[PDB]
Amino acid sequence: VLRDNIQGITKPAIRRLARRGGVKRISGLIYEETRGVLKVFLENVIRDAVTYTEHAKRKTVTAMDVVYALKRQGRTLYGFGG
Amino acid sequence: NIQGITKPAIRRLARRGGVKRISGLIYEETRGVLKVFLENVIRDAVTYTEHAKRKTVTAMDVVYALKRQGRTLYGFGG
Amino acid sequence: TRSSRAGLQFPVGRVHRLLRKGNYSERVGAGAPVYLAAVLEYLTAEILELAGNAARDNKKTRIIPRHLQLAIRNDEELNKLLGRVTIAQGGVLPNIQAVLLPKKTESHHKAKGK
Amino acid sequence: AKTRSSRAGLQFPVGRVHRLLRKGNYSERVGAGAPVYLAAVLEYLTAEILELAGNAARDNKKTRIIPRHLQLAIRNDEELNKLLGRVTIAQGGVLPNIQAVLLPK
Amino acid sequence: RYRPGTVALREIRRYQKSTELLIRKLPFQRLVREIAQDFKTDLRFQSSAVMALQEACEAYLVGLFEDTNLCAIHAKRVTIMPKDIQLARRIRGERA
Amino acid sequence: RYRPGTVALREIRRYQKSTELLIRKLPFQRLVREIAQDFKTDLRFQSSAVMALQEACEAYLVGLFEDTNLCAIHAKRVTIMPKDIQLARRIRGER
Amino acid sequence: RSRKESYSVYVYKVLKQVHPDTGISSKAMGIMNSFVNDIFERIAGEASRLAHYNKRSTITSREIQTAVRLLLPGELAKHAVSEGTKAVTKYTSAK
Amino acid sequence: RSRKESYSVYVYKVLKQVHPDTGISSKAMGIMNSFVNDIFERIAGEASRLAHYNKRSTITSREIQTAVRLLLPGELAKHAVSEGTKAVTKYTSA
DNA sequence: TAGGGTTAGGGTTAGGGTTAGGGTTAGGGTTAGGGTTAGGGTTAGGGTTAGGGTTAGGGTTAGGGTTAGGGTTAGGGTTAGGGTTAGGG
DNA sequence: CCCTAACCCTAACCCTAACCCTAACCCTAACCCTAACCCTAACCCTAACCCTAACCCTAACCCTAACCCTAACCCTAACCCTAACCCTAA
């Protein structure tokens, strides 16, 4: 069983992300809030990809199903896939 | 016609929206935003009416333009 | 008719003809319109139940757009299913914020000279 | 003469768009001038995008088209930003537009 | 005779409990026709379209006022400012 | 030896001028697989899908951080707070 | 004189089935008709997209079931799926 | 194996026509292909919606022209309309 | 397996959170003064429908010319050392 | 002082200049399906005008919702050394 994977996003990673996004000062609970938001978004995206893979009569999620789920959610992605 | 939106109208709109205090330039900013939105909607409706080979804008073209812009409207039309 | 065989009330042939005329696919099945009619029937039943509950809570025996707007904004699932949906002559919720309140009296009537 | 590219004065294929429109089941009858119009619009859009990418590459002292140059050309043009609003480009980048308050003062 | 900042809640509740229209009809029609005359002249409107556009503008203004009031409450300010509507228009995505 | 609130702009410019990835690979893959195991087990990933999901999450986090920084700047505060991310998630429409 | 769809008799029958002591108005009927039309259009679009993605020409109940599972959240999706499967079994058992 | 579309040769020809001293990569080619596919899908959807709204069965150049005028803003829309009309006149005269 | 991107103890200093008073642009009620709301006259285009003679998109059918998958090495760009030039505490 | 942007040696590093063969792309020959035009009648949109009665425009006021130095203080990140857990091909 896989556990302790939610704490994989280290503090320097979020610090570099905030520095790239233009944030010059970070508090304390911002890391936990961003972790929860990313977890919720990943859960929704993975659920959509699982539904698409089950509709396609497959098991391994491919890049085409990921692009389809991203287009259904409302955020297109170019470059990856086709 | 741009000054048709009176001050009591915006005051009642802000009271209905939950605003308990209004400044001064808020009226002019809301007037400009409404003018821009009306201009865009009227342009879309004019394009739809020109595509439909008509002149008078009907409610169906208005509903189509509202659905194209991304804000559906129920009740009015069909 | 299909209503006496599938145990529903929504028309199936109408949805089938609409799907065939809409040019959505080359071949439209026969069980797929039944499934869509069942889903639409369940959704309409839930919406009508919510509207009836709102009308009974508002001491009314009819369905008005205000009751529909209230039932839509009250249910969390209906709010997520119909997010950016504007209903004409519907209304808004009078949920006043915690800060927008008359609050407590400071210095009786806010007067330091008394 | 034999192809539509030598008759319409374009380079994008028209029969491919016509076959895609016929196979996509978008309408009962797909015209013949409509695919030419779509090919011309796509050709103009591709020419404008390639011109912007070449300008960005020349400004960045590069002779190739990288996703960074495309992202810069998309975010720089106001029309391209409105046409492609919620479009995420992988390995593209962001603009280093620092705010007026975020300064050492 | 009442004190300020107390009778506004009564008017807010009275305007929220009612589902009537606040914007007029003739000035709105005149403004819509004046805006439509800029693109193509000799245009007509079957009234119902103007009412639908007025309802849509009312809903948009109500949503914008709600967002501005929420942003002002978060910013520790009961009143609103043009910078608040600018932040609202910037975060919502509609232009800028 | 430098003063605080001055060397942050250099790191910001260095991270903005680069288009490399900041999040790792093995922990992200482990988290994605652990999340996918909650719905249906015996699931596989062809790496490219995980990279696409990581890029999408990075873009979403960058946009959220930009919106939060803009809201904090408008609120006369260089730092951010959980209430700022709450206001961002409330105004943006996402829940 | 033309002919319009106007989904009103079926809605009135469903309302009388769930609550025969209440009624409906013309504005509420139009709102319900617009909502039903929008739901049907979304379902048709999702089914067409799924058929174009799966490289298929026909449409079965699985496509609409997946479209409902994707559009509807959770509890409503499961309830609609169960009701649809029950209706399908009832229509198959009784020719 | 199979066969894919891959809009690459035409994009390379257009690039060599506007600038023969520059090139393109595989990632940029894929991005351009995805953008072209998305634009084509949006145009097809708009044309289908216009045909369903106008109660027609055929598709002419007017529908795609209106779809371009509605999708594109202003200057780009006018330029694309002018180029399309020029191409249509050139294809009709020859 | 190996090695460099994470992890933690020390510390003092600079930025959110509380204090005290003034003055101006915002509330709140009153009365003299237009512009909005229906109420009610014909009409000058505007949109809907049926019948009859036309012209470009959808029905097989062979034949060609060009777009998709390999071989190899060559030619734009990443990385590897410093030396000279400049932003700041 | 402590980094900081700017010029010349090479070593990997990633696209570009011809090729080739396989589904895919245009013409010709006959045809009906649904595109815009005028003949056409009446129902909806519009302009000057009586009314008379709720509220929008100006006029004096004084007070509390607003803001600029004081002066006491406790919260957050400038080094830097230690340690452990990410980052690299087979």
From Swiss-Prot, chain A:
Effect of K11R: Abolished ufmylation
Post-translational modification: Acetylated as part of spermatogenesis progression prior to histone-to-protamine exchange. Demethylation is performed by JMJD6.
N6-butyryllysine: modified positions: K11, K24, K57, K59, K71
Protein encoded by which gene: H4C1
Outcome reported for the amino acid change (mutating K71R): In TEBIVANED1; results in severe early developmental defects when expressed in zebrafish embryos; results in defective cell cycle progression when expressed in zebrafish embryos
Subcellular location: Nucleus; Chromosome
Outcome after substituting R25C: In TEBIVANED3
Parent-record interval covered: 22 to 103 of 103
This protein's name: Histone H4
Residue numbers bearing the N6-(2-hydroxyisobutyryl)lysine modification: K11, K24, K39, K57, K59, K71
Modified residues (N6-lactoyllysine): K11, K57, K71
From Swiss-Prot, chain D:
Glycyl lysine isopeptide (Lys-Gly) (interchain with G-Cter in ubiquitin), cross-linked positions: K2
Top-rank taxon: Eukaryota
Record GO biological process: chromatin organization; heterochromatin formation; negative regulation of cell population proliferation; protein localization to CENP-A containing chromatin
Post-translational modification: It is involved in the initiation of both imprinted and random X inactivation. Ubiquitinated H2A is enriched in inactive X chromosome chromatin. Ubiquitination of H2A functions downstream of methylation of 'Lys-27' of histone H3 (H3K27me). H2AK119Ub by RNF2/RING2 can also be induced by ultraviolet and may be involved in DNA repair. Glutamine methylation at Gln-91 (H2AQ104me) by FBL is specifically dedicated to polymerase I. It is present at 35S ribosomal DNA locus and impairs binding of the FACT complex.
Residues found modified as N6-glutaryllysine: K82, K105
Protein name: Histone H2A type 1-B/E
Subunit structure: The nucleosome is a histone octamer containing two molecules each of H2A, H2B, H3 and H4 assembled in one H3-H4 heterotetramer and two H2A-H2B heterodimers. The octamer wraps approximately 147 bp of DNA.
Organism placement in taxonomy: Eukaryota, Metazoa, Chordata, Craniata, Vertebrata
Record PTM N6-succinyllysine, positions in chain: K82
Gene designation per UniProt: H2AC4
UniProtKB/Swiss-Prot annotation, chain E:
Residues bearing PTM N6,N6-dimethyllysine: K40
Residue(s) carrying N6-methyllysine: K17, K25, K40, K83
Modification N6-succinyllysine occurs at: K17, K40, K83
A cellular component annotation (GO) from this entry: membrane
Positions of post-translational N6-(beta-hydroxybutyryl)lysine modification: K17, K40, K83
Disease: Glioma: Gliomas are benign or malignant central nervous system neoplasms derived from glial cells. They comprise astrocytomas and glioblastoma multiforme that are derived from astrocytes, oligodendrogliomas derived from oligodendrocytes and ependymomas derived from ependymocytes. The mechanism through which mutations lead to tumorigenesis involves altered histones methylation with gain of global H3K27 methylation, altered Polycomb repressive complex 1 (PRC1) activity, aberrant epigenetic regulation of gene expression and impaired differentiation of mesenchimal progenitor cells.
Name of the protein this chain belongs to: Histone H3.1
Classification lineage: Eukaryota, Metazoa, Chordata, Craniata, Vertebrata
Residues of the full protein shown: 41 to 136 of 136
UniProtKB/Swiss-Prot annotation, chain G:
Omega-N-methylarginine modification, residue list: R56, R62
Protein's cellular compartments: Nucleus; Chromosome
Section covered of the full-length record: 32 to 126 of 126
Cross-link (Glycyl lysine isopeptide (Lys-Gly) (interchain with G-Cter in ubiquitin)): K4, K90
Name the record gives this protein: Histone H2B type 1-K
Family, similarity comment: Belongs to the histone H2B family.
Residues spanning the signal sequence: none
Keyword Disulfide bond on entry: no
Positions of modified residues (Dimethylated arginine): R49
Residues with Phosphothreonine modification: T85
Glycosylation-annotated residues: S82
